Amino acid sequence: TMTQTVHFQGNPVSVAGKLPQIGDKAKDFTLVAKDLSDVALSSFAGKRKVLNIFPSIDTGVCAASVRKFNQLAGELENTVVLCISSDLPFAQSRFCGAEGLSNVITLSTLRGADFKQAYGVAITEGPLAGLTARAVVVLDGQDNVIYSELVNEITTEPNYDAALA
Amino acid sequence: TMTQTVHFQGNPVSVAGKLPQIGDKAKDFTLVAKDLSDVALSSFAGKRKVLNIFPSIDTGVCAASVRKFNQLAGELENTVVLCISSDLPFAQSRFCGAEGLSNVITLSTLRGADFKQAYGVAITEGPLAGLTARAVVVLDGQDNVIYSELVNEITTEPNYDAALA
Protein backbone atom coordinates (compact mmCIF):
# COMPACT_ATOMS: atom_id res chain seq x y z
CA THR A 1 0.00 0.00 0.00
CA MET A 2 2.13 2.90 -1.36
CA THR A 3 0.87 6.44 -1.98
CA GLN A 4 1.65 9.45 -4.11
CA THR A 5 0.46 13.02 -3.65
CA VAL A 6 -1.20 15.15 -6.28
CA HIS A 7 -2.99 18.44 -5.84
CA PHE A 8 -6.36 20.12 -6.49
CA GLN A 9 -4.97 23.59 -7.41
CA GLY A 10 -2.66 23.41 -4.43
CA ASN A 11 -3.96 20.83 -1.86
CA PRO A 12 -2.74 17.28 -0.96
CA VAL A 13 -4.72 14.30 -2.25
CA SER A 14 -3.70 10.68 -1.70
CA VAL A 15 -3.60 8.41 -4.72
CA ALA A 16 -3.32 4.67 -4.06
CA GLY A 17 -0.51 2.62 -5.71
CA LYS A 18 2.30 3.92 -7.88
CA LEU A 19 2.06 4.65 -11.63
CA PRO A 20 3.93 2.13 -13.82
CA GLN A 21 7.24 3.68 -14.99
CA ILE A 22 9.78 3.31 -17.81
CA GLY A 23 10.91 -0.28 -18.03
CA ASP A 24 7.89 -1.73 -16.23
CA LYS A 25 5.49 -4.05 -17.88
CA ALA A 26 1.99 -2.55 -17.49
CA LYS A 27 -0.55 -4.88 -15.99
CA ASP A 28 -3.21 -6.11 -18.36
CA PHE A 29 -6.72 -4.54 -17.74
CA THR A 30 -10.35 -4.98 -18.78
CA LEU A 31 -12.60 -1.91 -19.02
CA VAL A 32 -16.03 -1.10 -20.55
CA ALA A 33 -16.55 0.11 -24.17
CA LYS A 34 -19.32 2.27 -25.75
CA ASP A 35 -21.41 -0.74 -26.73
CA LEU A 36 -21.08 -2.06 -23.14
CA SER A 37 -18.75 -4.95 -24.18
CA ASP A 38 -15.69 -5.55 -22.00
CA VAL A 39 -12.37 -4.76 -23.68
CA ALA A 40 -8.87 -5.82 -22.57
CA LEU A 41 -5.48 -4.27 -23.16
CA SER A 42 -4.59 -7.67 -24.59
CA SER A 43 -6.90 -6.96 -27.58
CA PHE A 44 -4.40 -4.22 -28.74
CA ALA A 45 -1.28 -6.48 -28.80
CA GLY A 46 1.21 -5.10 -31.37
CA LYS A 47 -0.36 -1.64 -31.53
CA ARG A 48 1.18 0.93 -29.34
CA LYS A 49 -1.16 2.63 -26.77
CA VAL A 50 -1.77 6.04 -25.28
CA LEU A 51 -3.77 5.92 -22.11
CA ASN A 52 -5.25 9.16 -21.17
CA ILE A 53 -6.78 8.71 -17.78
CA PHE A 54 -8.59 11.60 -16.25
CA PRO A 55 -11.03 12.36 -13.40
CA SER A 56 -14.05 13.07 -15.66
CA ILE A 57 -14.73 13.97 -19.25
CA ASP A 58 -17.60 16.38 -18.49
CA THR A 59 -14.94 18.24 -16.64
CA GLY A 60 -13.05 21.10 -18.28
CA VAL A 61 -9.37 20.18 -18.62
CA CYS A 62 -10.30 16.45 -19.05
CA ALA A 63 -12.47 17.35 -22.04
CA ALA A 64 -9.52 19.32 -23.59
CA SER A 65 -7.48 16.12 -23.09
CA VAL A 66 -9.87 14.17 -25.21
CA ARG A 67 -10.25 16.66 -28.06
CA LYS A 68 -6.47 17.10 -28.34
CA PHE A 69 -5.54 13.40 -28.29
CA ASN A 70 -8.36 12.80 -30.84
CA GLN A 71 -6.88 15.44 -33.11
CA LEU A 72 -3.35 14.20 -32.34
CA ALA A 73 -4.58 10.67 -33.01
CA GLY A 74 -4.80 11.07 -36.81
CA GLU A 75 -1.22 12.34 -37.08
CA LEU A 76 -0.12 9.01 -35.43
CA GLU A 77 1.54 5.73 -36.28
CA ASN A 78 0.33 2.18 -35.31
CA THR A 79 -1.20 3.51 -32.08
CA VAL A 80 -4.58 3.54 -30.38
CA VAL A 81 -5.72 6.23 -27.97
CA LEU A 82 -7.73 5.01 -25.07
CA CYS A 83 -9.57 7.62 -23.14
CA ILE A 84 -10.01 5.98 -19.73
CA SER A 85 -12.00 7.24 -16.85
CA SER A 86 -14.38 7.09 -14.05
CA ASP A 87 -17.28 8.13 -16.29
CA LEU A 88 -19.91 5.81 -17.33
CA PRO A 89 -19.74 4.90 -20.98
CA PHE A 90 -22.96 6.73 -21.83
CA ALA A 91 -21.39 10.02 -20.86
CA GLN A 92 -18.18 9.11 -22.55
CA SER A 93 -20.29 8.41 -25.68
CA ARG A 94 -22.45 11.56 -25.56
CA PHE A 95 -19.37 13.70 -25.18
CA CYS A 96 -17.65 12.26 -28.24
CA GLY A 97 -20.86 12.08 -30.28
CA ALA A 98 -21.58 15.79 -29.55
CA GLU A 99 -18.04 16.75 -30.46
CA GLY A 100 -17.75 14.54 -33.49
CA LEU A 101 -14.64 12.81 -32.02
CA SER A 102 -14.16 9.45 -33.76
CA ASN A 103 -10.46 8.65 -33.51
CA VAL A 104 -10.27 7.93 -29.77
CA ILE A 105 -11.59 4.94 -27.93
CA THR A 106 -13.50 5.45 -24.65
CA LEU A 107 -13.08 2.96 -21.77
CA SER A 108 -15.14 3.10 -18.52
CA THR A 109 -14.11 1.75 -15.08
CA LEU A 110 -17.78 0.94 -14.64
CA ARG A 111 -16.32 -2.62 -14.61
CA GLY A 112 -12.66 -3.42 -14.03
CA ALA A 113 -12.25 -0.75 -11.30
CA ASP A 114 -9.16 -2.58 -9.89
CA PHE A 115 -7.34 -0.88 -12.77
CA LYS A 116 -7.24 2.15 -10.57
CA GLN A 117 -4.84 0.77 -7.94
CA ALA A 118 -3.25 -1.53 -10.54
CA TYR A 119 -2.12 1.65 -12.37
CA GLY A 120 -1.50 3.87 -9.31
CA VAL A 121 -4.58 5.82 -10.18
CA ALA A 122 -7.25 5.62 -7.41
CA ILE A 123 -7.98 8.72 -5.43
CA THR A 124 -8.55 7.65 -1.85
CA GLU A 125 -9.34 10.91 0.04
CA GLY A 126 -11.09 14.25 -0.35
CA PRO A 127 -14.11 15.08 -2.49
CA LEU A 128 -12.44 13.30 -5.44
CA ALA A 129 -12.36 9.82 -3.85
CA GLY A 130 -13.73 7.18 -6.24
CA LEU A 131 -12.28 8.98 -9.31
CA THR A 132 -9.11 8.28 -11.26
CA ALA A 133 -6.37 10.81 -11.09
CA ARG A 134 -5.12 12.56 -14.24
CA ALA A 135 -2.34 10.72 -15.91
CA VAL A 136 -1.08 9.60 -19.27
CA VAL A 137 0.79 6.38 -19.89
CA VAL A 138 2.13 5.14 -23.15
CA LEU A 139 2.95 1.56 -23.94
CA ASP A 140 4.40 -0.49 -26.84
CA GLY A 141 2.92 -3.51 -28.63
CA GLN A 142 3.94 -5.68 -25.63
CA ASP A 143 2.56 -3.44 -22.79
CA ASN A 144 5.95 -1.99 -21.80
CA VAL A 145 6.16 1.48 -20.36
CA ILE A 146 7.50 3.66 -23.11
CA TYR A 147 6.30 6.79 -21.23
CA SER A 148 4.22 7.69 -18.19
CA GLU A 149 3.13 10.85 -16.40
CA LEU A 150 1.29 11.47 -13.16
CA VAL A 151 0.13 15.06 -13.17
CA ASN A 152 1.02 17.04 -10.04
CA GLU A 153 -1.80 19.60 -10.05
CA ILE A 154 -4.98 18.07 -11.52
CA THR A 155 -6.05 21.52 -12.66
CA THR A 156 -3.37 21.63 -15.38
CA GLU A 157 -3.44 19.37 -18.44
CA PRO A 158 -0.85 16.76 -19.21
CA ASN A 159 2.18 17.41 -21.37
CA TYR A 160 1.33 15.91 -24.75
CA ASP A 161 4.33 16.83 -26.85
CA ALA A 162 6.71 16.25 -24.89
CA ALA A 163 6.94 13.53 -24.07
CA LEU A 164 5.85 11.79 -27.25
CA ALA A 165 7.90 9.01 -28.84
CA THR B 1 -27.79 -13.46 -1.34
CA MET B 2 -31.29 -13.24 -2.92
CA THR B 3 -32.02 -12.26 -6.53
CA GLN B 4 -34.77 -10.77 -8.62
CA THR B 5 -35.13 -10.80 -12.39
CA VAL B 6 -35.73 -7.79 -14.58
CA HIS B 7 -35.49 -7.55 -18.33
CA PHE B 8 -33.72 -5.59 -21.10
CA GLN B 9 -36.68 -5.47 -23.55
CA GLY B 10 -37.31 -9.13 -22.92
CA ASN B 11 -34.14 -10.82 -21.49
CA PRO B 12 -33.26 -12.02 -17.93
CA VAL B 13 -30.90 -9.92 -15.82
CA SER B 14 -29.97 -10.72 -12.22
CA VAL B 15 -30.30 -7.96 -9.67
CA ALA B 16 -28.68 -8.54 -6.27
CA GLY B 17 -30.75 -8.17 -3.05
CA LYS B 18 -34.45 -7.44 -2.79
CA LEU B 19 -36.06 -3.97 -2.97
CA PRO B 20 -37.38 -2.69 0.38
CA GLN B 21 -41.19 -3.09 0.48
CA ILE B 22 -44.22 -1.60 2.24
CA GLY B 23 -43.71 -1.76 5.98
CA ASP B 24 -39.93 -2.06 5.82
CA LYS B 25 -37.64 0.53 7.22
CA ALA B 26 -35.28 1.61 4.41
CA LYS B 27 -31.62 1.42 5.27
CA ASP B 28 -29.88 4.73 5.69
CA PHE B 29 -27.44 5.60 2.78
CA THR B 30 -24.72 8.10 1.90
CA LEU B 31 -24.28 9.16 -1.74
CA VAL B 32 -22.44 11.98 -3.60
CA ALA B 33 -23.97 15.43 -4.36
CA LYS B 34 -23.25 17.95 -7.17
CA ASP B 35 -20.68 19.83 -5.13
CA LEU B 36 -18.95 16.49 -4.35
CA SER B 37 -20.04 16.54 -0.65
CA ASP B 38 -21.41 13.29 0.78
CA VAL B 39 -25.12 13.38 1.64
CA ALA B 40 -27.07 10.93 3.82
CA LEU B 41 -30.72 9.97 3.86
CA SER B 42 -30.57 11.01 7.50
CA SER B 43 -30.18 14.67 6.39
CA PHE B 44 -33.84 14.56 5.08
CA ALA B 45 -35.45 13.37 8.37
CA GLY B 46 -39.08 14.59 8.51
CA LYS B 47 -39.33 15.28 4.77
CA ARG B 48 -40.80 12.56 2.74
CA LYS B 49 -38.59 11.17 -0.13
CA VAL B 50 -38.95 9.96 -3.68
CA LEU B 51 -36.02 7.94 -4.85
CA ASN B 52 -35.81 7.61 -8.52
CA ILE B 53 -33.03 5.21 -9.22
CA PHE B 54 -32.17 4.49 -12.80
CA PRO B 55 -29.37 2.92 -14.88
CA SER B 56 -28.11 6.21 -16.38
CA ILE B 57 -29.37 9.73 -16.93
CA ASP B 58 -27.75 10.17 -20.36
CA THR B 59 -29.97 7.30 -21.27
CA GLY B 60 -33.38 7.89 -22.86
CA VAL B 61 -36.11 6.67 -20.51
CA CYS B 62 -33.95 7.57 -17.44
CA ALA B 63 -33.75 11.17 -18.66
CA ALA B 64 -37.60 11.26 -19.04
CA SER B 65 -37.71 10.05 -15.41
CA VAL B 66 -35.78 13.05 -14.27
CA ARG B 67 -37.66 15.70 -16.24
CA LYS B 68 -41.03 14.34 -15.09
CA PHE B 69 -40.20 14.03 -11.39
CA ASN B 70 -38.67 17.55 -11.58
CA GLN B 71 -41.89 18.89 -13.04
CA LEU B 72 -43.93 16.73 -10.63
CA ALA B 73 -41.70 17.99 -7.81
CA GLY B 74 -43.20 21.51 -7.69
CA GLU B 75 -46.76 20.19 -7.38
CA LEU B 76 -45.59 18.34 -4.18
CA GLU B 77 -45.89 18.52 -0.42
CA ASN B 78 -43.01 18.28 2.17
CA THR B 79 -41.05 15.96 -0.14
CA VAL B 80 -37.63 15.86 -1.76
CA VAL B 81 -36.89 14.07 -5.02
CA LEU B 82 -33.58 12.34 -5.15
CA CYS B 83 -32.42 11.27 -8.54
CA ILE B 84 -30.02 8.43 -7.75
CA SER B 85 -27.78 6.63 -10.11
CA SER B 86 -24.67 5.11 -11.34
CA ASP B 87 -23.64 8.32 -13.10
CA LEU B 88 -20.93 10.46 -11.89
CA PRO B 89 -22.13 13.73 -10.44
CA PHE B 90 -20.63 15.80 -13.25
CA ALA B 91 -22.92 14.14 -15.75
CA GLN B 92 -25.81 14.34 -13.40
CA SER B 93 -25.05 18.09 -13.12
CA ARG B 94 -24.57 18.79 -16.85
CA PHE B 95 -27.84 17.06 -17.62
CA CYS B 96 -29.84 19.16 -15.18
CA GLY B 97 -27.96 22.37 -15.98
CA ALA B 98 -28.66 21.88 -19.73
CA GLU B 99 -32.32 21.18 -19.06
CA GLY B 100 -32.81 23.87 -16.48
CA LEU B 101 -34.03 21.28 -13.90
CA SER B 102 -33.68 22.77 -10.41
CA ASN B 103 -36.26 21.01 -8.25
CA VAL B 104 -34.62 17.57 -8.09
CA ILE B 105 -31.55 16.57 -6.18
CA THR B 106 -28.90 14.39 -7.90
CA LEU B 107 -27.04 11.68 -5.92
CA SER B 108 -24.14 9.62 -7.36
CA THR B 109 -23.04 6.10 -6.25
CA LEU B 110 -19.54 7.29 -7.04
CA ARG B 111 -19.20 6.77 -3.24
CA GLY B 112 -21.61 4.72 -1.15
CA ALA B 113 -21.99 1.99 -3.82
CA ASP B 114 -23.16 -0.54 -1.15
CA PHE B 115 -26.52 1.24 -1.53
CA LYS B 116 -27.01 -0.90 -4.56
CA GLN B 117 -27.33 -4.25 -2.76
CA ALA B 118 -28.69 -2.49 0.35
CA TYR B 119 -31.68 -1.42 -1.80
CA GLY B 120 -31.91 -4.53 -4.03
CA VAL B 121 -30.57 -2.50 -6.88
CA ALA B 122 -27.22 -3.88 -8.19
CA ILE B 123 -27.15 -5.47 -11.58
CA THR B 124 -24.81 -8.43 -11.39
CA GLU B 125 -24.80 -9.91 -14.93
CA GLY B 126 -24.94 -8.94 -18.60
CA PRO B 127 -23.69 -5.74 -20.22
CA LEU B 128 -25.46 -3.73 -17.49
CA ALA B 129 -23.42 -5.08 -14.56
CA GLY B 130 -22.13 -2.24 -12.36
CA LEU B 131 -25.30 -0.14 -12.94
CA THR B 132 -28.36 0.30 -10.76
CA ALA B 133 -31.59 -1.09 -11.98
CA ARG B 134 -34.60 1.17 -12.58
CA ALA B 135 -36.75 1.55 -9.56
CA VAL B 136 -38.64 4.10 -7.54
CA VAL B 137 -39.04 3.98 -3.79
CA VAL B 138 -40.90 6.42 -1.64
CA LEU B 139 -40.36 6.91 2.04
CA ASP B 140 -41.83 8.98 4.92
CA GLY B 141 -40.05 11.34 7.33
CA GLN B 142 -38.77 8.26 9.24
CA ASP B 143 -37.47 6.20 6.25
CA ASN B 144 -40.45 3.82 6.13
CA VAL B 145 -41.52 2.31 2.85
CA ILE B 146 -44.63 4.15 1.83
CA TYR B 147 -44.22 2.85 -1.77
CA SER B 148 -41.71 0.95 -3.87
CA GLU B 149 -41.46 -0.32 -7.43
CA LEU B 150 -38.93 -2.49 -9.22
CA VAL B 151 -39.51 -2.12 -12.92
CA ASN B 152 -39.83 -5.40 -14.84
CA GLU B 153 -38.62 -4.28 -18.27
CA ILE B 154 -35.97 -1.55 -17.93
CA THR B 155 -37.02 -0.18 -21.30
CA THR B 156 -40.33 1.14 -19.93
CA GLU B 157 -40.52 4.02 -17.45
CA PRO B 158 -41.83 3.70 -13.94
CA ASN B 159 -45.44 4.35 -12.99
CA TYR B 160 -45.45 7.82 -11.46
CA ASP B 161 -49.12 8.42 -10.79
CA ALA B 162 -50.02 5.66 -9.62
CA ALA B 163 -48.74 4.92 -7.18
CA LEU B 164 -48.38 8.32 -5.56
CA ALA B 165 -49.50 8.98 -1.99
Numbering used by the authors:
A (entry chain A), B (entry chain A): 0 to 164
Task: Please give sentences taken from the publication describing this entry.
Crystal forms 1 and 2 grew in conditions containing DTT, and the solved structures were in the reduced state. Crystal form 2, diffracting to 2.35 Å, comprises a single subunit in the asymmetric unit, the complete dimer being made up by symmetry operators. As there are only minor differences between the two reduced structures, with an r.m.s.d. of 0.4 Å over 160 Cα, only the highest resolution structure (space group P21) will be discussed here. There are no salt bridges or covalent bonds between the two dimers in the reduced structure. The partial unfolding of α1 opens a cleft in Tpx formed between the loops connecting β1 and α1, α3 and β6, and β7 and α5 on subunit A and connecting β1 and β2, and β4 and α2 on subunit B. When in the reduced state, C61 is orientated into the pocket where it is available for oxidation by H2O2 or alkyl peroxides. During transition to the reduced form, the loop containing G59 to C61 folds into the binding pocket predicted to accommodate the compound. Similarly, the side chain of R133 undergoes a significant conformational change. Collectively, these conformational changes reduce the overall volume of the binding pocket and are predicted to affect the binding of ME0052 to the reduced state of ypTpx by inducing steric clashes. In fact, MOE Dock as not able to find a suitable docking pose for the reduced state of ypTpx, presumably because the binding site is occluded by the folded extension of the α1 helix in the reduced state.
